[PDB]
Amino acid sequence: TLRDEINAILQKRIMVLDGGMGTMIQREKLEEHFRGQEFKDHARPLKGNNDILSITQPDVIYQIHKEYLLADIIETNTFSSTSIAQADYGLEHLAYRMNMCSAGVARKAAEEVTLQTGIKRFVAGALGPTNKTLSVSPSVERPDYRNITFDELVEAYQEQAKGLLDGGVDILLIETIFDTANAKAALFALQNLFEEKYAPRPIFISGTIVDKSGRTLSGQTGEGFVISVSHGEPLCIGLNCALGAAEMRPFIEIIGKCTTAYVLCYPNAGFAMDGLVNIVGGCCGSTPDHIREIAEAVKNCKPRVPPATAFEGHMLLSGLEPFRIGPYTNFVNIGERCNVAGSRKFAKLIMAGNYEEALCVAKVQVEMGAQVLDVNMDDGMLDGPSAMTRFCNLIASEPDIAKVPLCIDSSNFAVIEAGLKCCQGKCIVNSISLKEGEDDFLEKARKIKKYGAAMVVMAFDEEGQATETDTKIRVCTRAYHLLVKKLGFNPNDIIFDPNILTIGTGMEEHNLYAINFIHATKVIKETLPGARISGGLSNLSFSFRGMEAIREAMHGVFLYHAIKSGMDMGIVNAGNLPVYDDIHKELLQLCEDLIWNKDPEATEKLLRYAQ
Numbered sequence: 329t330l331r332d333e334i335n336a337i338l339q340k341r342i343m344v345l346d347g348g349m350g351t352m353i354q355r356e357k358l359e360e361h362f363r364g365q366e367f368k369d370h371a372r373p374l375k376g377n378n379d380i381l382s383i384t385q386p387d388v389i390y391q392i393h394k395e396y397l398l399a400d401i402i403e404t405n406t407f408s409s410t411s412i413a414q415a416d417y418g419l420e421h422l423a424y425r426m427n428m429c430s431a432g433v434a435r436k437a438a439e440e441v442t443l444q445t446g447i448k449r450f451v452a453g454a455l456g457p458t459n460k461t462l463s464v465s466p467s468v469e470r471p472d473y474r475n476i477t478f479d480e481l482v483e484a485y486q487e488q489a490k491g492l493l494d495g496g497v498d499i500l501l502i503e504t505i506f507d508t509a510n511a512k513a514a515l516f517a518l519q520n521l522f523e524e525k526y527a528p529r530p531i532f533i534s535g536t537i538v539d540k541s542g543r544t545l546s547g548q549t550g551e552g553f554v555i556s557v558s559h560g561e562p563l564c565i566g567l568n569c570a571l572g573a574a575e576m577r578p579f580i581e582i583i584g585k586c587t588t589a590y591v592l593c594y595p596n597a598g599f600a601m602d603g604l605v606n607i608v609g610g611c612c613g614s615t616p617d618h619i620r621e622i623a624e625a626v627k628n629c630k631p632r633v634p635p636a637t638a639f640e641g642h643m644l645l646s647g648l649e650p651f652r653i654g655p656y657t658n659f660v661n662i663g664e665r666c667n668v669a670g671s672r673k674f675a676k677l678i679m680a681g682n683y684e685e686a687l688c689v690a691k692v693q694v695e696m697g698a699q700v701l702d703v704n705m706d707d708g709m710l711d712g713p714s715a716m717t718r719f720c721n722l723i724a725s726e727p728d729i730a731k732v733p734l735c736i737d738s739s740n741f742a743v744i745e746a747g748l749k750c751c752q753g754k755c756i757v758n759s760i761s762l763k764e765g766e767d768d769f770l771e772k773a774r775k776i777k778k779y780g781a782a783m784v785v786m787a788f789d790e791e792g793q794a795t796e797t798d799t800k801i802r803v804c805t806r807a808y809h810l811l812v813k814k815l816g817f818n819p820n821d822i823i824f825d826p827n828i829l830t831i832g833t834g835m836e837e838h839n840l841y842a843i844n845f846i847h848a849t850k851v852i853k854e855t856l857p858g859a860r861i862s863g864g865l866s867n868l869s870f871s872f873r874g875m876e877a878i879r880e881a882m883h884g885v886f887l888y889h890a891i892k893s894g895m896d897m898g899i900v901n902a903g904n905l906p907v908y909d910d911i912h913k914e915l916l917q918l919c920e921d922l923i924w925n926k927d928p929e930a931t932e933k934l935l936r937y938a939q
């Protein structure tokens with residue numbers, strides 16, 4: 329494969345990527361007339377559309393490539409060769425052919441330099457960002473609204489991809505990523521083609537930081553960015569344009585310590601690294617005369633040593649900023665309040681269409697200790713997919729809320745699927761189960777892996793809801809086997825939810841429920857390596873609604889033990905979780921008896937505690 333030959337050269341020498349072609353074409357000093365012969369009577373002006381020059385001025389583009397190759401990896405002249413971008417020139421219908429030609433003219437140059445020079449050259453298929461932003465609204469007036477959709481972007485990128493691959497490119501390069509959701513759509517397009525039609529080529533992914541803040545246009549940090557696109561298994565990852573080498577330095581060394589991939593990096597004008605870069609090039613301002621200076625400098629430099637064990641046993645999530653759950657990370661609070669069924673206010677504000685004030689419920693939860701936000705829009709009086717889509721897009725607007733990862737909560741996979749399309753960072757999916765059999769579970773788990781989300785697996789199968797310690801273990805053990813073995817799902821992306829069910833009901837059947845969850849948590853944490861444990865905590869205490877002090881006390885008493893058994897996270901009321909040591913010793917001991925069913929009349933004695 330090309331990956332072998334690619335990784336081989338990279339392990340020995342730091343490769344070079346060509347400068348931006350736009351600078352050279354600008355120097356060429358075209359005129360509208362010069363695009364071209366073929367068109368002649370085109371109703372839209374083509375001047376400035378560098379992409380069509382592959383057809384209308386091929387020799388010019390070919391010579392641009394040659395200069396760089398002699399002065400190497402060559403980008404295809406395909407930065408705007410999508411349906412979306414070419415609509416501004418009335419060439420929507422021409423995307424595939426433009427990429428095909430752009431890849432041919434580049435491939436002809438590559439091989440001449442390969443013949444004359446002796447060393448092999450590579451063609452990079454450039455996929456660009458388009459002007460559409462899937463994570464940012466066109467205006468602050470309507471923050472729910474979006475111009476393009478995920479599926480619309482996937483279609484376009486898929487078509488561009490076909491052309492490049494057919495045109496015989498050696499690397500697909502998703503570059504100048506202003507918005508990460510676009511890049512995720514591009515990655516989804518590439519996975520579509522590879523799944524059956526094509527043999528996979530290596531993917532290079534380059535972000536674009538705008539300021540000294542270290543953030544993308546879509547507000548995301550480098551660390552958050554790599555997590556959001558790691559599922560694409562890119563051979564190389566980096567940054568390009570917008571910033572010079574000096575401004576763009578400290579972000580690269582952050583990115584490099586967070587990934588096993590090689591590190592691309594091609595800055596701009598208005599530089600030998602310290603083990604920071606694996607591939608080097610230029611963008612706006614870079615000429616072939618620059619690349620020569622870059623080439624002679626990097627000639628004898630020792631390439632970066634990628635860490636092959638970077639965040640090995642961590643669950644990687646991301647909002648705008650990264651959020652990692654390693655073995656020694658403490659209990660992660662996933663905020664419960666943004667749930668139409670489980671919250672009185674939230675439901676009233678969603679059903680009444682007041683989404684702007686509903687964001688305050690998300691904002692306050694994060695301020696009150698919520699590290700992930702659970703979003704649940706399930707109600708018979710709601711259009712699930714749209715409301716999720718709407719609320720997710722609104723959250724993205726508010727930077728305080730958007731920082732954290734999101735937990736997409738629905739009993740309907742189409743709602744799940746809608747939220748994933750609208751989320752820029754890596755989310756938790758909540759949930760799937762074996763309720764409808766193995767094949768259905770696998771199809772849904774196969775789709776989630778494709779979007780690249782973490783995932784909650786409910787302790788539910790064909791028999792129904794798992795309420796016993798053994799039944800809980802059975803389902804999770806079977807599930808773990810299907811995910812890890814049959815699908816190659818990363819076991820660190822698997823959360824299992826043995827079901828936290830109500831106790832204290834006055835029905836002896838429900839008495840062991842808490843214990844079973846804690847016991848099952850132990851065996852699962854020991855049985856199934858990598859997987860983590862979650863649970864909806866407030867379900868435990870439906871029996872004592874009204875008495876909040878008891879509910880909160882129950883939660884704290886429950887957690888203390890659960891956490892000891894191996895509970896990594898939960899869907900909880902983040903502000904209102906007392907510390908185990910500061911809970912009154914009488915109430916603590918009472919709840920301890922209820923959770924562990926040690927006292928036969930534990931129910932009445934708890935409700936007795938009020939007074």
Ligand SMILES: Nc1nc2c(c(=O)[nH]1)N[C@@H](CNc1ccc(C(=O)N[C@@H](CCC(=O)O)C(=O)O)cc1)CN2
Binds near residue numbers: 665
């Ligand atoms: N994977 C998983 N996901 C889940 C659950 C689970 O188990 N497992 N259970 C639910 C977790 N979320 C909540 C949120 C709130 C409450 C709750 O307790 N609400 C109050 C009402 C609060 C209010 O109206 O303000 C009540 O008593 O009904 C319970 C569970 C939904 N998602």
